[PDB]
Design an enzyme around this catalytic site. Structure first.
Site, PDB file in Angstrom:
ATOM      1  CG  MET A 176      -1.863   0.991   1.102  1.00  0.00           C
ATOM      2  SD  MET A 176      -2.920   1.428   0.043  1.00  0.00           S
ATOM      3  CE  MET A 176      -3.787  -0.304  -0.395  1.00  0.00           C
ATOM      4  CG  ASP A 232      10.556   5.057   0.768  1.00  0.00           C
ATOM      5  OD1 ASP A 232       9.517   5.222   0.896  1.00  0.00           O
ATOM      6  OD2 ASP A 232      11.476   5.832   0.199  1.00  0.00           O
ATOM      7  N   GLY A 238       9.942   8.957   1.879  1.00  0.00           N
ATOM      8  CA  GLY A 238       8.919   9.341   2.441  1.00  0.00           C
ATOM      9  C   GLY A 238       7.423   8.544   2.494  1.00  0.00           C
TER      10      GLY A 238
END
Ligand SMILES: Cc1ncc(C[n+]2csc(CCOP(=O)(O)OP(=O)(O)O)c2C)c(N)n1
Ligand SMILES: Cc1ncc(C[n+]2csc(CCOP(=O)(O)OP(=O)(O)O)c2C)c(N)n1
Ligand SMILES: Cc1ncc(C[n+]2csc(CCOP(=O)(O)OP(=O)(O)O)c2C)c(N)n1
Ligand SMILES: [Mg+2]
Ligand SMILES: [Mg+2]
Ligand SMILES: [Mg+2]
Lengths: 545, 542, 542
Positions: free
Chosen positions: C382, C435, C464
């Site tokens: 997600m 990430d 981020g």
């Protein structure tokens, strides 16, 4: 420790250690060993006709003695029938310990959800809910249930007792049946100085202020200071008009109380055993006064309740110390004295000791006057929920009862009779008067057999309108038509006598006092039906908040 | 603090946090809770994004344990909240004050076809509430801090429906206890018992390790010189150096002077102690006068039914108790022998040249004690290494040690260390764990690097779950699911931008630790360990 | 299967698992549950130790989704169970059959001063029970599998008290449904409605994507040629290639042919669909004949109150429905236009030379489609990349895609991929995440290496939490808590013993993916992404 043949014997021994004098309940297979063990003890077994009432009776014992009343019921419906009782007790802060039976720990019916998860069901309405899973920690759990119910802010506690645990042997000992000191000496001195400087101070009494262990200290502080006092209904019985000239009435129901006006005027408000949940702070806290909070627990900060000073600790100790730091009695400010002067005038107007009031059915005021005639300082008074409840609350300043059980936040009907029986058992030499409407009466009237069996000296008064009036006046105010609030009439005199109790039915205003008097003089349980004309209720309701 | 009209409930929340003295918030943003992260931008409160919510709860716990004020975690709805559960349960068990603010769907969609987070958190918290009344937003938060910080500290959960935090509300921020010592009368009753005691002993619990009780505790011990023993929740309250009559930590090893003194006792005085900290059955023979001193009445148990209970402000009670102690204690023959044995015991436990590789546990402990000084906070994860470190706590001289872990949650060390460092960023923190515990929270290394946290994490490497393996070995004489593959932790640490080291020989141990300690920022040292001798240590456990 | 006397309840459990066709178990051992791991040693069942319990639930879900038989997670008490919560909730939301076996303290210590795990799992599972009757151990387990696997699949939790699994028990293993099609009478009533429909459309839900319904579904579509649209839980049920009248996936984008056909519909037939899969309000105008076909009665909603409900065996019902369809459908003018637009839409969405670096999302998607072939299972985490991949699902030709994620739980991809690979170890699996999602479950790379799993994990790197950042940007025009530090994912992957790659230029993208795909075993590729154009895609979302 000892080798106990049955866990029930250890439970009973723990109850004795807790000072339990009697147990209320109904037996069943799962819990019968406990009723059996009570036969070999000093504890009196009191069988009731409905479990709900066992909880109500236990609540009364708790509120009066300060020590937890005990209810004992069997599994399944045995426990579920107590729920309303436990929630009511928890709400009003009455210590009650309920012991409920359950299937054996390894019963496969538990995995198939064939047996009620009573712990989950009671958790929402209790302060402590738990199931004994370890036979060796039996006395421990029972002991903790009492501590949880009697300490801090009192409440109800539920303990589930699996059948195998109470029937099987265990090894343990009886745990003997707190020592919290007053608030810090520096904070008390601080408050004593705020008091010495205040021109319009006032005490707001809450639940913890009405606890029996704080009665002496409260009396001493009021007598030494002579500072005005107002109370929430959870402390309705702590002080009354007759025992303190500067009493300002109970707040939380009527919109014209002197207590509310004095609080608004106050430059210093001292709350004792008070919680914002007892009465909306927005109703009295203007923020223009120094606020002191005295209780066994820290305050629940809120928009309109941010104490400037908090004295946490033993209430009695804190009040005694404070009393010792008061050099003189308060000289009322012109404004404060004026407000008390007005309450004096309103009581004069609410009064009617000289009016005829001979209409029939009876006018609520005529019944209230007659009730005042029989309720004296040696008589306990319990009040159910319904329209008559509002009438009695309005005139609480006129009842000179030894004690009154009326607070009922959940507004549970049917509590009066059971409360009276429990109150009577605490002081069997005194008389108890219970009052309800026909709706509430019929929800617990089965306990009339219990009363006759005990030869309980309880006088129950029934305000008869043949309907749920308190709900009807709300429907009328909102919809101008009624629904589900009307039922048929009944012959209550014959109803009562069928139990073996003395029954009476007022047939005219003139017969009211004589009937109540003869009923009061009856040595044993009695019931008096009083037809009432609720047409003036709107007038009284106009005084509500 | 006047009643205002707020554009967003989120703004009231933030102001309430500032009123509580909150300096930073840990968490991960999400749609439902983003307005709060946005509100923090206009705040003096620092936003500290973590890589896994569980770690927000761990870092917040360290902050709470150290400052006495609740650590704060902020997460979004659904998995954001469920990911905090283990962290919240761990804090509640160790008595660390934590307040978690969790997002949720708008109130109207609750019964719509969302997690019943309150029901899931209720079992592992002291306070679990959902804001259903927009105008009581500041109240629920404020009282959540009260629940976390007062009495026996613990964790508190608050569910914030999206519409409540995004919508406007009216209200005022509420200002951020005044309880006195126990009844003087009772304090004398206890002082009298102390004068009649032949073998008096102090059993310290969680509340006894609170800073607000430090001075009074020392004052009480210096005046009475009565021996002392502590549960692991009060492991740091007293140490061997400052009290020659210290009897060690109780609860783990079967040969402690503390237990022998407890059994020998005729008078036992527990301070800030609760049964959950150490099974009373394990030490309460049942024939000693038991005194209970705490902020809360005793939580009675089968073998813990105190004869006297002094409830109230601990520091006040202890101060008053000290003033009622005339003569210092003269140890009885048995008491003195027991303490003398602990001394001989230490001499033995200390007494060789362990230059084998992989490294012998004792060698690692020895090296660890060298780098951990009185200005350093030491955090310890859960695993076999934990037992080794515990065995030698008497020779560790750290500023503070976070080791207590009743739930035995692995992965606590690094996040705890990061939390402790943020409280005192000018000091160094050292965390130690096994390879298993390391990978459960190692994602926070990025957070550590991002913050420039001066944390040194040590890893005892055995390539498995040893603490479990030894129990299986003992019970089944065979292993299952406790062995995994090896890793190059040096490159692992460097990949984050931190300094990595991998000890490849015994002689390289000490030098590697120094190079790592000298690093101004995050550093990790992997240390291969030979757990072959664990059976000899385990024989010392209850 | 006779009634036997077992030395340990743990032995009955294991035999029960074998009876359920369980091939492996995921989890982490602990003292309370170790006897079960030990029992598995004498089993044909493979013990697969994970590095974080949450991932045991994710891997088990993939196994369940693919085989139809419950995936199994095994954990110890306390944090072992609480660490599974998010995983269990995710499986329950996606309808993946999972059975978690969690350890617990001996029954007698439950009320002693342990987590009420049943209460914590009850909110996120279909079945949550604790074994209190030792002689009903096989029953509770067996019925847990029934709860996970039947009706609408979901997760099931079973708490195993230590004394029950270690102590002896008596009992027999229980053998591992026979429901018929809907009432023939009703099937005709529906067949009649289909003959009268001008704009009929099929809305496929979760149950429609089950393998047991494959043949019957295709047979029904080939015979009627009625257009089809799917929720993301049935994303794989039908694709553009096998059905020219496919109208795409509904629930995410505001310009789908499926929604236009639904709005245009006079007859809507939902198969294996439940409102939770796609807000009925979003597509049910309210003036169309709504038929509901599923294994369970309809879960009525405001805008989902079917006129006809065909409850029973789906495959049987569809087969009978097909046999009652005389003529194939002739698309109405509007229907045909709508489908023609989707074709023009695809041509547009496909139509340039994006050689910028960091890489443009479209470039990454394009490259991804090249490596993902019909023999590969694709798992999607997600984050913003999720939206990009969803937008182009029509051009992805994978064996299967695990993308549905109502809870929006990050970290699912890698563990799902590992679970899917174990089901078909001879095939390659590809997982992709951001990430942020990567670090929440990347600890399983060791597990992947240990297993020699042929999994390729791709990481879109922006440093981020972009999916959150774009929502904040839109709503507040500023960011908070969505930015973190960079990492060298190449060294990170290599540290585990896996093959690492870090794309440093656009031209290096494709070659790097190939080198990674050619690796026989775990491999990770970090891909720097430029999310600047996300606003243009977001304008396409509801
Ligand atoms: C158990 C329960 N159900 C419903 C109510 C709501 N309600 C409040 S008081 C009351 C009864 C009024 O009947 P009665 O007791 O006859 O008093 P009246 O007002 O008619 O004098 C009802 C129905 C309640 N309090 N308790
Ligand atoms: C979240 C969680 N799952 C399972 C356990 C049970 N257990 C206790 S400590 C531990 C790990 C031991 O691994 P490691 O951290 O590598 O330490 P070692 O004992 O091997 O040095 C395990 C698996 C736990 N404490 N926490
Ligand atoms: C456990 C958990 N916490 C918070 C969220 C809220 N949120 C949704 S996706 C996501 C992460 C985005 O990071 P990344 O995986 O790096 O993907 P990107 O969108 O940046 O490509 C977050 C934080 C979530 N889904 N799961
Ligand atoms: Mg009535
Ligand atoms: Mg290890
Ligand atoms: Mg990202």
């Amino acid at each position: 420790v000892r080798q106990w043949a049955h866990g029930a014997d250890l439970v009973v021994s723990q109850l004795e250690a807790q000072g339990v004098r009697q147990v209320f309940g109904i037996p069943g297979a799962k819990i019968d060993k406990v009723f059996d063990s009570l036969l070999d003890s000093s504890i009196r077994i009191i069988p009731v006709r409905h479990e709900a009432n066992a909880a109500f009776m236990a609540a009364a014992v708790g509120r009066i003695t300060g020590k937890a009343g005990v209810a004992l019921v069997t599994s399944g419906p045995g426990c579920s029938n107590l729920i309303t009782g436990m929630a009511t007790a928890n709400s009003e802060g009455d210590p009650v310990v309920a012991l409920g039976g359950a299937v054996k720990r390894a019963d496969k019916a538990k995995q198939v959800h064939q047996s009620m998860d009573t712990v989950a069901m009671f958790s929402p309405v209790t302060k402590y809910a738990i199931e004994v899973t370890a036979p060796d920690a039996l006395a421990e759990v029972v002991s903790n249930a009492f501590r949880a119910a009697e300490q801090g802010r009192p409440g109800s506690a539920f303990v589930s007792l699996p059948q195998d645990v109470v029937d099987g042997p265990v090894s343990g000992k009886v745990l003997p049946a707190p020592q919290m000191g007053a608030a810090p000496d520096d904070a008390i001195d601080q408050v004593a100085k705020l008091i010495a400087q205040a021109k319009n101070p006032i005490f707001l009494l809450g639940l913890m202020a009405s606890q029996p262990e704080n009665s002496k200290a409260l009396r001493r502080l009021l007598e030494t200071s002579h500072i005005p006092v107002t109370s929430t209904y959870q402390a309705a019985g702590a002080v009354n008009q007759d025992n303190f000239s500067r009493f300002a009435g109970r707040v939380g129901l009527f919109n014209n109380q002197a207590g509310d006006r004095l609080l608004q005027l106050a430059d210093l408000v001292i709350c004792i055993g008070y919680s914002p949940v007892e009465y909306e702070p927005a109703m009295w806290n203007s923020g223009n006064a120094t606020l002191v909070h005295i209780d066994v627990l820290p305050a629940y900060e809120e928009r309109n309740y941010t104490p400037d000073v908090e004295l946490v600790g033993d209430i009695a100790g804190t009040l005694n110390k404070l009393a010792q730091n008061i050099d003189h009695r308060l000289v009322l400010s012109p404004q404060a004295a004026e407000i008390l002067r007005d309450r004096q005038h309103q009581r004069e107007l609410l009064d009617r000791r000289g009016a005829q009031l001979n209409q029939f059915a009876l006018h609520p005021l005529r019944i209230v006057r007659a009730m005042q005639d029989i309720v004296n300082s040696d008589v306990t008074l319990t009040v159910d929920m319904g329209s008559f409840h509002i009438w009695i609350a309005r005139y609480l300043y006129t009842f000179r009862a030894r004690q009154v059980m009326i607070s009922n936040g959940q507004q549970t009907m049917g509590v009066a009779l059971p409360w009276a029986i429990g109150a009577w058992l605490v002081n069997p030499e005194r008389k108890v008067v219970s009052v309800s409407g026909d709706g509430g009466f019929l929800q617990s009237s089965m306990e009339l057999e219990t009363a006759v069996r005990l030869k309980a000296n309880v006088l129950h008064l029934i305000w008869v309108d043949n309907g749920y009036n308190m709900v009807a006046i709300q429907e009328e105010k909102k919809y101008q038509r009624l629904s589900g609030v009307e039922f048929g009439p009944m012959d209550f005199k014959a109803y009562a006598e069928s139990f073996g109790a003395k029954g009476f039915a007022v047939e005219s205003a003139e017969a009211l006092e004589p009937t109540l008097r003869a009923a009061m003089d009856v040595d044993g349980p009695a019931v008096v039906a009083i037809p009432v004309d609720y047409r003036d209720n709107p007038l009284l309701m106009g005084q509500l908040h």
